[PDB]
Amino acid sequence: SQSNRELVVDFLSYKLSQKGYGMAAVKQALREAGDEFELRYRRAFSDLTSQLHITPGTAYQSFEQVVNELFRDGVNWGRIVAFFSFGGALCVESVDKKMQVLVSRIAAWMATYLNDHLEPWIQENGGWATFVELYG
Amino acid sequence: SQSNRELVVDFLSYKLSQKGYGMAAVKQALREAGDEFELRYRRAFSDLTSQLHITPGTAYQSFEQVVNELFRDGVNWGRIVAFFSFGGALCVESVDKKMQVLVSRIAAWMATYLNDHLEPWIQENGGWATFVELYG
Numbered sequence: 001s002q003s004n005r006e007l008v009v010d011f012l013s014y015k016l017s018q019k020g021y022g023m024a025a026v027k028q029a030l031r032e033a034g035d036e037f038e039l040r041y042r043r044a045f046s047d048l049t050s051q052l053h054i055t056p057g058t059a060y061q062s063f064e065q066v067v068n069e070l071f072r073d074g075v076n077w078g079r080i081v082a083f084f085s086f087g088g089a090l091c092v093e094s095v096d097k098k099m100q101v102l103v104s105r106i107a108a109w110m111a112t113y114l115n116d117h118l119e120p121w122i123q124e125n126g127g128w129a130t131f132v133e134l135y136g
Numbered sequence: 137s138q139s140n141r142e143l144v145v146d147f148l149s150y151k152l153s154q155k156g157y158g159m160a161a162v163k164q165a166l167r168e169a170g171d172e173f174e175l176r177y178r179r180a181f182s183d184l185t186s187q188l189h190i191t192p193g194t195a196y197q198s199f200e201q202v203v204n205e206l207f208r209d210g211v212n213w214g215r216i217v218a219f220f221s222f223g224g225a226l227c228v229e230s231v232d233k234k235m236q237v238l239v240s241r242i243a244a245w246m247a248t249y250l251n252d253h254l255e256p257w258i259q260e261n262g263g264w265a266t267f268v269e270l271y272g
């Protein structure tokens with residue numbers, strides 16, 4: 001869906017710009033939730049960037065397997081925030097290693113995973129409007 | 137949920153009995169779909185029983201990783217049928233190796249995976265009532 005892709009591009013651009021490189025309410029809540037996750041929560045959970053070791057040869061299937069570990073106990077809003085934040089970290093780490101080409105690929109991976117695996121839970125749980133009420 | 141667990145126990149008991157060892161409409165459609173999968177489709181896909189090699193030491197996480205391969209591209213009714221049928225085969229193979237104790241465990245794995253990963257898609261796609269209309 002275009003709405004999921006828009007959220008992905010907005011969050012990734014925000015994270016890249018933050019580091020030096022419509023749906024307004026949803027985008028804002030997402031940006032804020034991602035920031036909170038990075039400041040307080042990222043440190044406690046298993047570091048997924050260590051498990052992926054991204055490069056131009058990295059396949060979507062590899063990304064998919066690592067993200068599955070994130071949702072192993074099911075989906076919830078906090079986990080979706082960790083997922084967006086994980087994608088942001090891969091983009092930042094990609095731009096550092098001079099592989100800016102991987103950004104658009106990571107974006108596609110995220111949108112794809114969202115549409116294929118997370119969308120049903122999102123819609124069944126009130127949609128993004130509900131995320132705003134809880135995290136925004 | 138209790139409704140998912142009931143479907144799992146009904147299907148497993150049905151498969152076990154077939155090999156010599158409420159929700160009536162859903163249970164019937166599921167039994168019938170599972171039979172069609174075994175008669176027509178099982179031969180046309182990769183054998184997951186080869187990837188699990190079940191024993192009393194087999195962890196849920198192992199089962200989860202194998203099932204994930206089944207839904208790697210997403211969920212649909214036919215894939216859910218393949219999933220029930222896969223659980224049925226593990227139970228049959230467990231009773232054959234004298235490990236009848238694993239049956240209740242496999243049942244719990246299935247109910248768990250259903251509730252944690254498949255339920256949202258099911259509800260967003262018309263619920264079990266829709267499965268009955270299509271496969272029943």
Ligand SMILES: CN(C)CC#Cc1ccc(OCCCc2sc(N3CCc4cccc(C(=O)Nc5nc6ccccc6s5)c4C3)nc2C(=O)O)c(F)c1
Pocket residue numbers: 032033034036037041042045046047048049069070071076078079081082083085086087089134135136
């Ligand atoms: C309202 N105001 C105040 C605004 C606000 C707010 C607000 C509050 C709370 C918030 O988070 C709460 C925790 C969310 C989570 S994360 C999680 N697991 C599941 C198991 C699991 C297993 C393996 C790995 C991971 C993992 O994520 N590894 C990563 N590696 C990297 C590396 C780089 C970058 C990102 C990542 S992520 C996980 C993550 N589970 C939960 C949960 O809540 O259940 C929040 F985000 C925002």
Ligand SMILES: CN(C)CC#Cc1ccc(OCCCc2sc(N3CCc4cccc(C(=O)Nc5nc6ccccc6s5)c4C3)nc2C(=O)O)c(F)c1
Pocket residue numbers: 168169170172173177178181182183184185205206207212213214215217218219221222223225270271272
């Ligand atoms: C109408 N009336 C007459 C009633 C009816 C009916 C009716 C109609 C259609 C039906 O299925 C259609 C195909 C469904 C599937 S399966 C599938 N892949 C994804 C890729 C993939 C990858 C790896 C493994 C598997 C896998 O499954 N491995 C297994 N190993 C074992 C071993 C033992 C036991 C079970 C199993 S399963 C798969 C399965 N994809 C699809 C799909 O349709 O997308 C059906 F079941 C019933």
